[PDB]
């Protein structure tokens, strides 16, 4: 049974609600982005209308085999009428294809559903500037002040400078980057660009990247691993054992691995600056954990909400414990008292 925070009142709509069977009253199912916790339940046998971005609809057709007749892609930043209701899709600054959804209810209520997002001051100049929002369905993944991390641009600077130094010192070093979903593609594209290389990967991952509308992608990636000195592997293989096994397979081309694990936040963020980050090392293998986030930090989240001034907030993450729900409610009230709405 579908939980209340996935239903949009006064509509026939649900958001990210594919694992509940046939939801009573639902005439259109929205999907904010192609991450497994959100698409859970979709498959080639789904027979109701799915509304999403063009990039999400490419992934639905090629990776999940949803039939074409049920995929309804909408352009961004464009007023569209769905089943008699005005909607707008906005870029979420999450992974490729990820959107926020504005719903203009027939009674005059305006609802923003953020999906998963990394809030940014640029959103203060989208179509959100132009009218009031009554209800906010909010990605609260990092809603606590302990959750700090650097900008994406600082993290990519660190990765590029680290990889370029290592490979210039040792031209026989291989760089490996971990992945387990879409998102975070800048990590491996930025490193391969400084090295003058394509990124090498499995056929399965190449197929996924080919659905993302990245400019000039054919110039940037390949399935020919032998031609590439940046390799992608499953996140599970980014450990000393898995990396040793991979180095064996490269036929003595390489004598060292430098690997990256993009994570979200980790407790080593509560002590160490990005500049001071060091790897774990065993022999000729070194592994960096880098804090590349596609979700709002606490401060980014608080700025967005204090600018938007919603009348009511419904969290969509960390909703399963009383302690989490009470913590989030306290911060929402602080923010409103501080800003005066
Ligand atoms: Ni996500």
Swiss-Prot record:
Tissue expression: Expressed in brain, heart, kidney, liver, pancreas, placenta and skeletal muscle.
Annotated compartments: Nucleus
Consequence of substituting residue 139 to N: Impaired nuclear focus formation, reduced interaction with PIAS and increased sensitivity to cisplatin
Induction: During mitosis. The mRNA encoding this protein contains an internal ribosome entry site (IRES) in its 5'-UTR. This 5'-UTR generally suppresses translation while specifically promoting expression during mitosis, when cap-dependent translation may be impaired.
Family statement drawn from the similarity comment of this UniProt entry: Belongs to the DNA repair metallo-beta-lactamase (DRMBL) family.
General function of this protein: May be required for DNA interstrand cross-link repair. Also required for checkpoint mediated cell cycle arrest in early prophase in response to mitotic spindle poisons. Possesses beta-lactamase activity, catalyzing the hydrolysis of penicillin G and nitrocefin. Exhibits no activity towards other beta-lactam antibiotic classes including cephalosporins (cefotaxime) and carbapenems (imipenem).
Subunit details: Binds constitutively to TP53BP1. Binds CDC27, which is itself a component of the anaphase promoting complex (APC). Binds PIAS1.
Protein name as annotated: DNA cross-link repair 1A protein
Source organism (scientific name): Homo sapiens (Human)
């Amino acid at each position: 049974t579908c939980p209340f925070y996935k239903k949009i009142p006064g509509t026939g709509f649900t958001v990210d609600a594919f694992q509940y069977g046939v939801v009573e009253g639902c005439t259109a199912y929205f999907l904010t982005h192609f991450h497994s916790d959100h698409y859970a339940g979709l498959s080639k046998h789904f027979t109701f209308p799915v509304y999403c971005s063009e990039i999400t609809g490419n992934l639905l057709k090629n990776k999940l085999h949803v039939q074409e007749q049920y995929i309804h892609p909408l352009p961004l930043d464009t007023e569209c009428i769905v089943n008699g209701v005005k909607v707008v899709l906005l870029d979420a600054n999450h992974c490729p294809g990820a959107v926020m959804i504005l719903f203009y209810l027939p009674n005059g209520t305006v609802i923003l559903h953020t999906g998963d997002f990394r809030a940014d001051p640029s959103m203060e100049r989208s179509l959100l500037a132009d009218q009031k929002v009554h209800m906010l369905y909010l990605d609260t993944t990092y809603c606590s002040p302990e959750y700090t991390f650097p900008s994406q641009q600082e993290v990519i600077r660190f990765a590029i400078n680290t990889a370029f130094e290592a490979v210039t010192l040792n031209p026989h070093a291989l760089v490996v980057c971990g992945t387990y979903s879409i998102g975070k593609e800048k990590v491996f594209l930025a490193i391969a660009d400084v090295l003058g290389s394509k990124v090498g990967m499995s056929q399965e991952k190449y197929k996924t990247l080919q659905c993302l509308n990245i400019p000039e992608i054919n110039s940037l990636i390949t399935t020919d691993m032998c031609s590439s000195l940046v390799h992608l592997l499953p996140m599970m293989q980014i450990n000393f054992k898995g990396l040793q096994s991979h180095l064996k397979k490269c036929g003595g081309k390489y004598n060292q691995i430098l690997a990256f694990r993009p994570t979200g936040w980790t407790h080593s963020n509560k002590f160490t600056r990005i500049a001071d980050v060091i790897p774990q090392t065993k022999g000729n293998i070194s592994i960096y954990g880098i804090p590349y986030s596609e979700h709002s930090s606490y401060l980014e989240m608080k700025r967005f909400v204090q600018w938007l001034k919603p009348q009511k907030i419904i969290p969509t993450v960390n909703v399963g414990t009383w302690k989490s729900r009470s913590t989030m409610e306290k911060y929402f009230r602080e923010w409103k008292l501080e800003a005066g709405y």
